[PDB]
Scaffold this active site. Structure first.
Site, short mmCIF file in Angstrom:
data_model
loop_
_atom_site.label_atom_id
_atom_site.label_comp_id
_atom_site.label_asym_id
_atom_site.label_seq_id
_atom_site.Cartn_x
_atom_site.Cartn_y
_atom_site.Cartn_z
N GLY B 8 0.80 -1.26 0.00
CA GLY B 8 0.00 0.00 0.00
C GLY B 8 0.81 1.27 0.00
N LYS B 39 -0.33 1.64 -5.01
CA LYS B 39 -0.66 2.91 -5.73
C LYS B 39 -0.29 2.89 -7.24
CE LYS B 39 -2.08 4.87 -1.80
NZ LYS B 39 -1.65 3.86 -0.81
N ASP B 114 -8.42 10.22 -0.15
CA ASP B 114 -8.16 11.44 -0.91
C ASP B 114 -9.41 11.88 -1.67
OD1 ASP B 114 -6.74 13.48 -2.57
OD2 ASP B 114 -4.95 12.60 -1.66
C1 WG4 Z 1 -4.51 4.98 5.23
C2 WG4 Z 1 -3.03 5.06 5.02
O1 WG4 Z 1 -2.27 5.00 5.99
N1 WG4 Z 1 -2.60 5.20 3.76
C3 WG4 Z 1 -1.25 5.23 3.43
N2 WG4 Z 1 -0.85 5.02 2.22
C4 WG4 Z 1 0.44 5.00 2.04
C5 WG4 Z 1 1.14 5.16 3.15
C6 WG4 Z 1 2.60 5.24 3.37
N3 WG4 Z 1 3.07 6.65 3.55
C7 WG4 Z 1 3.34 7.04 4.97
C8 WG4 Z 1 3.57 8.58 4.93
C9 WG4 Z 1 3.02 8.99 3.55
C10 WG4 Z 1 2.14 10.24 3.61
C11 WG4 Z 1 2.08 10.66 2.11
N4 WG4 Z 1 3.29 10.08 1.46
C12 WG4 Z 1 3.61 10.10 0.10
C13 WG4 Z 1 2.67 10.50 -0.90
C14 WG4 Z 1 3.05 10.50 -2.21
C15 WG4 Z 1 2.09 10.97 -3.29
N5 WG4 Z 1 4.33 10.09 -2.51
C16 WG4 Z 1 5.01 9.97 -3.70
C17 WG4 Z 1 6.25 9.51 -3.42
N6 WG4 Z 1 6.35 9.36 -2.11
C18 WG4 Z 1 5.21 9.70 -1.53
N7 WG4 Z 1 4.83 9.71 -0.25
C19 WG4 Z 1 4.08 9.49 2.57
C20 WG4 Z 1 2.28 7.78 2.99
S1 WG4 Z 1 0.06 5.35 4.50
#
Ligand code: WG4
Ligand code: WG4
Ligand code: CA
Lengths: 449, 430
Positions: B8, B39, B114
């Protein structure tokens, strides 16, 4: 007129796929260059197990590569590094190197790079009675390889001291290079990276001194576009810091580019432009590169492509080893100047302009990032995805800070970072080290007095 | 209880073989779930209206079968939140669910992260289409304390969500933050009150998609076992690099199973289990257990350096309270020697990693190890110069001792402006 020009696959990390090598060769040929050097650190037969010949499959991939280069009007070189635990005078070791060369030669690969960049701390004991220095030992071993080729093909030698700093400043002061230049056969060309491994500038007086000690014009191995030294960085800007007036002083020009094949379109375009175009200018060259590169950014589901100005922004953000891009430099510089006071005046047009450009930079990065997620070529997307995220996050946090200063907070008030900046931002081992090993604005290291 | 891993994170999705390796580790660790939600899959989020072709659905059923063979359950994610009109789109979502359901994939994650009543209704529709078979887990828009405003019981969103989402549907929760330093019992009790059900934890403790510089090979920390009565499930969203997650999965399974769970003891057990993966190519060696342990110490946790690395740097900080440390002082001498030894051990580890049989594990840590080595080497060069006792006016000769390419670029330029002091406060150098 004629000269070895092109790319070495010579970086620390995963080697390129067959298709990536084909794409890069396309770009080399389009850019007016004529050479591909195969020497990725990931190949066990190059360095780690240099004694062991290729199996049939390994040799077949190499001949395919040679043919693929040939079809594009290009030459192909194959690297060997017999320097790890070599006894330079030993019969079995000399014979084992000769067998490696014999295999390649019998398969029609007579264009060789011999590398000697990593050796033990003192001369081996069995060699001390034959050879007076590492330079003499390496030279003799290379001359043996050259003589085995019987006047056919070409040998390029990577020395142990391959930059100014390793040679001690003025290369003519190196005992190693003095002995090397006098002892290595005249037919063998020598690599040189400039004053440093990654040279900010390569100047004519330097190369003239190098040619004196080597007793020949060097083949340049340029690391300007290399990114294997920093996990945080990629170089999509133009080639800079080398005047065209240096080209009479070299025998060749090979560039060791970014790890990510798709990142190297601007590196190859602009390096070819530098070698071809007498009026070469980095900012004009990157504009031409961006225009040529833009159709690679076509969108997957519909009839769009990422706008030329946002592709240009990509190069500006991810510009050069010793410079940020012209737009990004000016935006940060303007902000620095405006931040000489603890509380900038929100009514001051200097501050207002600096803040607005910062905000606009944020909006444009966001636009670029969103559109990159939508492009057809997923390899290009994944090349820049993480680098773009990083830049977006940094710009967003700076915008949140500058926005808080724009409210005119009292002098005693402290920025509400817990509500504005993620807990995970700027943490870990590298930050812990940088907290101790500080560096001030004039570039001087210290530990907070 | 649902226990395991979600794929995820933001970046490239795992290969078939990597998913197989991870499932092996899930099963070995006593856990039972794999959630597919990368993603990088266009059908999950970007083009959520579009059904899978035959090949895409076949890969999913293969994954379900591979999980089944290991005594595990398999979930498939959908994110109909990007440009959804919740009242319109409903049929397109129903078709997506129908495809998966007719192919035997009735374990679904619906994501709404989102963009409460509208999302609830849309999810209840999906649940009702399944006709009492399989299971729906809901990822809310506010999925952490910070997004809910501190105390989750003060969120209008969660209040409406908890009362409106069907009781059969479980809800994800990441703790007080997206990446929680601690998840405590009083917090989860408050979450359960507003949600009207025990949450399924989605833990991001081992995630590294937020920082290009970082990977987390240390043990799970900051969660007491006393929180586990307050949850309905525990899923971890781990590092991007599949081979990086051996310690994450090992220690998370240990945490969920072992009443005496203690992170430093758990990482020792993980390191012992992990060490045979570091077998050397052509010959009977492996990377020593103590150097694999060093790997975890260097690359430890989101909010802490490892115990060895912390103490080495802390000792050095104390010794560097003066502008010129006394080379005769045993505090300085000890700190410098341990720093030198740290450097030597990293070098040893790095060299041995280049020689391992498993090249995927090598390329997982190659760059991270280089980075650490370079930093330590520069600190040693600086401390070595201080050990010669230079005069107070003398300045460190950086040009001869540190590479010109070190610590440059756009992120460093931003950080030079947006400074942060030792107590954590932001400023711009007065
Ligand atoms: C419900 C939930 O817990 N859902 C999550 N889904 C993915 C997760 C893992 N990380 C942890 C911190 C965070 C916050 C946003 N984020 C991003 C966002 C984007 C677009 N990019 C692109 C490249 N690197 C990125 N990092 C880093 C998402 S937690
Ligand atoms: C003759 C020559 O110039 N040959 C080169 N070969 C590779 C090159 C490009 N980089 C530039 C700076 C430098 C110097 C050491 N270095 C390393 C070394 C290792 C082991 N790793 C691992 C991960 N990242 C690494 N970086 C970075 C080599 S230039
Ligand atoms: Ca670094």
């Amino acid at each position: 007129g004629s000269m070895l020009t092109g790319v070495i696959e010579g970086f620390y990390g995963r080697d390129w796929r067959r298709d990536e090598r084909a794409t890069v060769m396309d770009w080399i040929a389009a850019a007016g260059m004529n050479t591909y050097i195969y020497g990725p650190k990931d190949d066990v037969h190059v360095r780690a197990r240099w004694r062991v010949p290729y199996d049939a499959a390994g040799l077949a991939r190499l001949t395919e590569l040679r043919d693929a280069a040939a079809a594009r009007g290009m030459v192909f070189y194959v690297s060997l590094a017999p320097c790890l635990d070599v006894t330079y005078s030993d019969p079995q070791d000399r014979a084992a190197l000769l067998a490696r060369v014999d295999q390649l030669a019998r398969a029609g690969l007579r264009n060789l790079v011999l590398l000697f960049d990593d050796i033990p701390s003192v001369l081996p004991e069995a060699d001390r009675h034959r050879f007076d220095s590492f330079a003499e030992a390496q030279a003799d071993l290379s001359n043996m390889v050259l003589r085995h080729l019987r006047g056919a093909g070409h040998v390029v030698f990577c020395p142990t001291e391959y930059c100014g700093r390793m040679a001690g400043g003025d290369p003519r002061g190196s005992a190693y290079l003095q002995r090397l230049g006098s002892t290595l056969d005249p037919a063998i060309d020598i690599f040189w990276t400039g004053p440093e491994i990654v040279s900010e500038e390569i100047v004519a007086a330097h190369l003239a001194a190098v040619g004196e000690v080597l007793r020949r014009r060097p083949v340049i191995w340029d690391n300007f576009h290399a990114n294997d030294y920093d996990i945080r960085r990629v170089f999509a800007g133009p080639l800079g810091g080398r005047s065209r007036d240096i080209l009479p002083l070299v025998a060749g020009w090979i560039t060791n580019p970014n790890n990510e094949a798709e990142a190297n379109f601007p590196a190859i375009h602009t390096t070819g432009a530098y070698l071809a175009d007498p009026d070469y200018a980095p900012e004009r060259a990157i504009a031409a590169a961006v225009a040529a590169w833009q159709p690679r950014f076509r969108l997957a589901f519909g009839d769009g492509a990422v706008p030329s100005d946002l592709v240009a922004l990509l190069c500006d953000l991810f510009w050069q080893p010793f410079a940020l891009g012209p737009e990004t430099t000016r935006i940060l510089s303007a902000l620095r100047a405006a931040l000489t006071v603890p509380r900038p005046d929100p009514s001051d047009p200097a501050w207002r302009a600096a803040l607005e450009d910062l905000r606009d930079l944020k909006r444009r990065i966001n636009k670029l990032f969103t559109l990159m997620t939508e492009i057809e070529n997923r390899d290009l997307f994944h090349t820049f995805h993480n680098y773009l995220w990083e830049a977006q996050e940094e710009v967003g946090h700076l915008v949140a800070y500058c926005d808080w200063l724009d409210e005119a907070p009292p002098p005693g008030a402290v920025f509400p970072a817990t509500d504005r900046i993620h807990n995970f931002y700027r943490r870990g081992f590298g930050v812990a080290v940088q907290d101790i090993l500080q560096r001030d604005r004039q570039g001087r290291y210290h530990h907070g007095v």
